[PDB]
Amino acid sequence: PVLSKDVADIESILALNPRTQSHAALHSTLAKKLDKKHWKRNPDKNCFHCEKLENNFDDIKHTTLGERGALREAMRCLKCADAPCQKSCPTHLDIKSFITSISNKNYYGAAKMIFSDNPLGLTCGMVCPTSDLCVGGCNLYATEEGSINIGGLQQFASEVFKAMNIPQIRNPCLPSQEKMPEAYSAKIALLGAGPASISCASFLARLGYSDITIFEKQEYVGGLSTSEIPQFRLPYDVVNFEIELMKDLGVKIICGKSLSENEITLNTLKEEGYKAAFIGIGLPEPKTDDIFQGLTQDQGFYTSKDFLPLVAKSSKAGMCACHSPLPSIRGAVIVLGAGDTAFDCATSALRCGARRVFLVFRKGFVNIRAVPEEVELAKEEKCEFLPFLSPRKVIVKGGRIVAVQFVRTEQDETGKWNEDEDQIVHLKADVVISAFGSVLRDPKVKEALSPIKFNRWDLPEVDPETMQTSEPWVFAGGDIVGMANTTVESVNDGKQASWYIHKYIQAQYGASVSAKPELPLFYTPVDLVDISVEMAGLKFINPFGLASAAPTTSSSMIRRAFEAGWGFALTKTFSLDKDIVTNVSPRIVRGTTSGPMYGPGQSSFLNIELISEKTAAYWCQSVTELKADFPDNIVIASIMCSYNKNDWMELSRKAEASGADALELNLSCPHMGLACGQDPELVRNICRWVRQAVQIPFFAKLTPNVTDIVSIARAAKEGGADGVTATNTVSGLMGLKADGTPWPAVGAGKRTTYGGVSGTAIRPIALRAVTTIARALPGFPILATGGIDSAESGLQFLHSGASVLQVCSAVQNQDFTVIQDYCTGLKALLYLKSIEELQGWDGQSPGTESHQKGKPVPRIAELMGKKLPNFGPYLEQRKKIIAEEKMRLKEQNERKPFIPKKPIPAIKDVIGKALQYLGTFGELSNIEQVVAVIDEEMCINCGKCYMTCNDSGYQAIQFDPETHLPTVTDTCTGCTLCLSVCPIIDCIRMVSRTTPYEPKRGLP
Amino acid sequence: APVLSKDVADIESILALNPRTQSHAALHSTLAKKLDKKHWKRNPDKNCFHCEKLENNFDDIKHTTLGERGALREAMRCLKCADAPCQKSCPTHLDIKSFITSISNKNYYGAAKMIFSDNPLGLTCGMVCPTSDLCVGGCNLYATEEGSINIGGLQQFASEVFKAMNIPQIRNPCLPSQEKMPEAYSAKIALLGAGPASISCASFLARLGYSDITIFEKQEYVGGLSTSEIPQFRLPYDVVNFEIELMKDLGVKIICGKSLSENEITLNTLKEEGYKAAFIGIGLPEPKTDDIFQGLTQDQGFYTSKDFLPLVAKSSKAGMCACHSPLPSIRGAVIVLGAGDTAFDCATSALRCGARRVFLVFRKGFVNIRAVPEEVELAKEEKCEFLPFLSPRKVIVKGGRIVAVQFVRTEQDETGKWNEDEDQIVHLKADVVISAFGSVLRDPKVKEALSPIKFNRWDLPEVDPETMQTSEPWVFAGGDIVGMANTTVESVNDGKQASWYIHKYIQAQYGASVSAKPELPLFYTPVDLVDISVEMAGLKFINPFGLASAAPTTSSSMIRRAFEAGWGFALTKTFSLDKDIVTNVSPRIVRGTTSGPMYGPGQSSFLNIELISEKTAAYWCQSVTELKADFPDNIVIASIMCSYNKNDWMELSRKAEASGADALELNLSCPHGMGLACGQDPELVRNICRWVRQAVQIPFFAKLTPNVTDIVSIARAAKEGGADGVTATNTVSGLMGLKADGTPWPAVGAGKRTTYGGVSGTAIRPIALRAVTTIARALPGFPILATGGIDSAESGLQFLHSGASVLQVCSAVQNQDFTVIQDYCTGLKALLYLKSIEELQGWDGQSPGTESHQKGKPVPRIAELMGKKLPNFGPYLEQRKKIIAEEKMRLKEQNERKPFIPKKPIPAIKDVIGKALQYLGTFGELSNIEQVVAVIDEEMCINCGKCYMTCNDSGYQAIQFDPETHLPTVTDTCTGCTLCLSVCPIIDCIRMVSRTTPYEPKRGL
Ligand SMILES: Cc1cc2nc3c(=O)[nH]c(=O)nc-3n(C[C@H](O)[C@H](O)[C@H](O)COP(=O)(O)O)c2cc1C
Ligand code: SF4
């Protein structure tokens, strides 16, 4: 038969494969109208009714992210200097740093950075109104693709940390609890357990206070986050987690106790010996209006303070004791108001069963209080918005509300707002919910704050800088002070106050505090993991250092690097005065190795830079000053001589005399190629010259541009090197413009020469070189260089046989502060090895569960294996099946931390551990074969697996023409190409063949 | 002697905003925060209640517009789906996957060619299509957090670049010559109405070869609504003109001032005068009207959309008319009645005319708005007010001006039927009322001219929805007049559908039949006649692109499909003698980690531990015979491998030659015995080559590994040994990486074992390019087949420029599929074509020179703006706005397209081979006298400070970064190292210029 033609079955399997067309298509406008609905993913602008939402408390936020989505977006962020997003965060979170840790897969380092400045970091990730805060200042707003999803990035990192189940701890550098001065034992009260108090009590705890007590009116803690923000925007378990974090530091919570004249008052606190008090009780009561005088919830009337807690209590498991049921809401619902609260009233009304919801405002669309992302929630649930209407009368017939009469309003001159009594609207409805805001009105509570001063707004008056009321020992914060109306501002009030509280307590015990404010960061057991390592007789405080390169151009930069925490550094390579060089320019260019992506995370650089332009005398003096001031940081002098015995002997004694802890020999000079480093016998001889000139250790810097790097490592060891650095850059050319001229291009003649490629493009090459040397020379020290940009990539080199990790391109891409991500990242990776119940994880990434857009797919009987992708009529059936399960369920009414159960490994215990899995081809099994399996619930229906198997594989995948779901068939050979191009992490997995493996021989 | 390793005061000060690790939580009061937030704000302020002044401001407001930076990013994001749902959702069935693929490859010609093949109004549509109700509505990436592709922005970008090249449309080159057509193609054809429907209809008829096509148009202007009503700030008139001029390139004739109407043109008069077929494309020419407005005039303040939108257009669209023309002076409060596209365009245009305030008023509610959300959004962001549930009752006129309109509340019953409530009124003050209820066909003399075609229930001409034929067989109709659609693209498609059956009908009237299968022709330009063939080692390649010996050539059945798609040549997967037959493991091909955790399209490398073919030599030799028999012009190169054994290489090469391969390729991966592979030792390569040469007479190429100290020594040995060329290069030995627990990937067996593998793809391109360059330099004229990370026409041209003759591809196919060959071909043609165009030498290939932009829209060239140090945020952005507005008002008080011709002949491939080698040389051949310094275009900056951070911690501390404006300035410390330019997210925002000042190296001591 014709071997080069597909048989009919394969022809059939290929029916949807791309082919190029030679004619333009012909399809009628009506055929297209009728097929359009089949493929539709997004809401239909003609569909005027909202999906059945009754009892559905599923997450509706547009900003939620999963791991895949979070990595892409973290990689997009430009990680800006003096970032404006941080300037616009009310708690000043280091957004650059924490997004940088997410792009490095260091979710622990991200969460630590978030929680250091915001103890309610997960709450704020989910509910912050970022368009009015950090995101509205984002530089990327100036690009077509727009600002970064900061809130969803913050929420993703925090959720991972929550899932790691790691406790907060006391600051490891406080004195012991026994040895704290007596002032720390002072009795502190906080009133109210909302964000402001939670934050305030957190920060005092970090400073060392051991007797802190929050007093909360309700049986439940968390404030509005618990009692009013809907479960479908803020899950109750997020609040419980943040509270338990705080209780890890010893804060006590006593429920059932009120700030109120017959109960707790400032005078009673004074008499029981409390030394300071923080008022965070919020605004307990609803703003009301005479025209609703005396209407009951039976008749149909709620205030927002009556309604939202009813819903929250029955949707939020573990808010209270009781099970309560969802409020019976039926018919047409009018919500009065235009803020945050009115929009949560509207959407929570649909969850209780409302048929129609009307939002009615005093002014126009243009004037809506709330943020646009909050409005869009109501909008997409098809709430109707009625502007320019003020309520006048509620109509009650038969004991029930039946309508509300409004008058029309208009702005005049001045923009003066006037009601027009002649122009009326009679709006039929069954339930009315006023969402006019809130106030503190209860005279028993105002009198319990006696004697503190109140202002014109009838709120406690505070100094905006210190949060102190008129009584110096009483502070206040949050909604009750009336400047904040976000969670993150109330968090910030409690943080602001904590410092001034501390100042006041210390001064009451005769003690002074710093003039510069110093709130402690956030800490966990992770932070105590030891990541020091010892190599060739040096002790490194951590394994990360600056390679010999552009970041070590001047000794002042090394000095700043050591101040950020880098463990070690190489000088740029320097030489004898007779060999001094002069750079050309341009000389460092971006890598074209991942296509036309500009900005952060360049996958390579090319350089035609020569060695250092500064003299040996600058560098020698500089190593002396650096070793004097940083005795515990390793300094390594990189040196280069022509192939001359006296020169190498001179220059290495000089650099040793300066106090260098070690030397690094740069074998790039010309002299099996052109470089002394490409010829084993020249390597061995240069190393012998140096070995007998100096007593300190030295390392040969090996080039990867050789047939066999092992022969060059062995030569160095035979020459007397104490180790080898693997590897220098890869020889390369980064490309040409369309007209033929290169880049870089030097001078009038647009000339260039071959350069050195660095960055994550060469990491495969250096990893091979490190593992080849480690297998051939067991025990011989290796310094790794080549594409290390994270703790995670560093650990791959460690596992391969390296002991320390040299970095260049990742700093050129960013700045010296990535060391703090690298150190936290590596502590977390090692710590996580000791937790038994997280062994399903890859490093810091939890095992991927089936998601759609990073939201868990519903685990419902009636929905599995029944072939319903998330578009067209299929999606409509999904939502109908989901809606019925919510209804079925309504008719069917503890946080404990993981403890390590094995010692945490030190660097010395992981070095080399991958080598065991490496060997020859003949050591791999050809009996244990695999096949691809596709999780249809994760697929986004692109058909890339399909096309790759078609045109680079075995034609083994069927792509359904109506559902666009792929199925791997039994002709799969396990090549793994499909898994490798799929856009969804872990949507395709390889599993073991059950069936027998026969190779396709074409002809037997 | 002072402290060398510490920064002097000056530099400590330049470093003041550099990032530093913080060791404490920050303290900043809520008050200070509120106070500071406004300084940095980029986006609309939610507590700001009127929008900036727009008067006389016709600048682009579209949110979908893209510059080249942004387009390359968004194109690389598209998954380029099989059977893509976005295409199913486009009424003209554009091949979005192909045209986005082309954009990501920098082939803006092949993208525009793909768009215009299916849509002659491709630029207009890109700018105005309501994509959320069409193609983007169906996009698969909607199931990701970042969302669906900006397909419309991408369409508009490639179309704009194509407009910039000034290339004309040509009649299809493979058609007979004009003098050689059948008589039927001279049939006189008539189209009524120069709008999208007829332009598209006349375009496709002319592509089919009809020589005598006239559009008769009522007005003095052309373009229908795209000219007279869509605003200039959404659709610039020059775009309409460009697409009409493309049509006129095929000889379509346009006559203005001639109407379908009683006593002018009727179907009867066309029939008498010999016209053989007519297309009715006149749209819905009259406004839909309310009795409550009868008798109101423009001087009282009343307009319908049909009077008002053309008055704004004649004023703001340069030479729509030969009339100059002042804006309507629209002052005070404006009421616009309606909820479709028309009303939102009246609302936004009224602000350009000076309206203080605009009310859009609807009969129903916000839920029932007819425009798509993107169109609503434009009126929302300009602070129009929306009033729902009002129906108009009375217009009050005092002193000859409208002063108010009285409405009644509407509401919805118990059945969805829509009643008014007489006791519930709204009296809304206003000075101008603009009726936007839509459009109609009312004119009795127009309808009479269409006698006798049947009219339907809606009083519109009845057509069959498949054929667009009226009840008279020679008369077809399409577009708004049919009543089915109201988008540009659907009208374009009506005219497209009709043109096929019009052809079918005319051909029947002259006695000929047409295909059962519809066959509308593509779009062609002279770019398509470029020759990209090339001859190497005596073989003629129809184009230089071929499939490497690899995964895409696992089966000969795949090579067949590749040739069908157009690939110039292909290798077999490497095969051996029966005694050498291998068995692969699995898993064995893994995605690269070389560009981080990015998944899906465009992997930057792969790693494989795959062996040579598991199919036998018989299979491959019989296969080469069938392939050569069915594809005698496509080149088949048998790739072979033996151990180090003379009889074996001779037996197997003779078997492959006797199968009829055009050439052989020796895979020197094999072990025996300067490495383990034969390919790593020049002596063995020499001997193997000699052996093969004495055995066969066909050409043969040696495939080199890059895993050598000196690839030249190996190439040279293959040449000494007799080979006709070399293939440079095979994969690079690497280890793709480990999982955090130390296991590898791939991992084989329950042992999780692995071995070194080969890296392919664009990550290894700099290595392959250096290899190609260095052989081409040392062995000039010795043919080179290039391979390593070639994935576009642009990067294939780099290799040709560097000395290769033909270009092998593997990873770009694994990343996509065999159809990229269409993109590579049209891309190479366009690159070669552009070299002959004098007016376009500032471009780099198909990339215009970058113009200073924000979000890819051009920066107003106003001198009061130039160098005032006003970044685009906070209070500086408010000042930019005040200056641009005052300029627009200055302009208010002071009231030709011909194609470029090649001036050289168009280069052939052999003319460009090697041309980059004249720039390569040793290091000592570079000037260290001719130094540069970086220079920053503050107008392009996005204030990120990455240049600043790079120069501080990797450079010379030479940039100042302003603490209030976050503008960088480069100082005279600059050495030109060029790292800032390389990290800048904005293309061409930093440029290197010749050092003017004194260049002294900084020596420390
Ligand atoms: C899965 C796979 C299999 C390959 N098989 C061979 C082969 O059998 N013979 C060979 O000579 N080169 C083989 N190659 C190397 C390719 O032919 C090509 O040289 C390499 O992938 C570089 O081109 P690219 O960067 O376009 O992929 C293979 C590459 C891959 C990814
Ligand atoms: S806390 Fe809120 S404000 Fe701050 S960065 Fe986060 S999301 Fe933004």
Coordinates of C-alpha atoms and ligand atoms in Angstrom, one line a residue, chain A residues 88-91 93 95 98 118 124-125 128 130 133-134 150-151 154 488, ligand 2:
Chain A
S88 CA -0.9 54.4 46.5
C89 CA -1.4 51.4 48.9
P90 CA -2.6 52.7 52.2
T91 CA -0.3 50.2 54.0
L93 CA 3.2 47.1 50.8
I95 CA 4.4 45.5 45.7
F98 CA 6.3 40.7 46.5
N118 CA -0.7 44.2 56.2
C124 CA -7.3 43.0 51.4
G125 CA -6.2 41.0 48.4
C128 CA -9.4 46.1 48.3
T130 CA -7.6 48.7 43.8
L133 CA -5.8 52.6 45.4
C134 CA -2.6 50.8 44.3
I150 CA -2.2 43.6 42.1
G151 CA -5.1 42.4 44.3
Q154 CA -1.7 39.4 46.6
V488 CA -6.9 48.5 54.1
Ligands
SF4_2 S1 -3.3 46.2 50.2 FE1 -4.7 46.6 48.8 S2 -4.0 48.4 48.4 FE2 -2.4 47.6 49.1 S3 -1.4 46.7 47.5 FE3 -2.8 45.5 48.3 S4 -4.5 45.5 47.1 FE4 -3.4 47.1 46.9

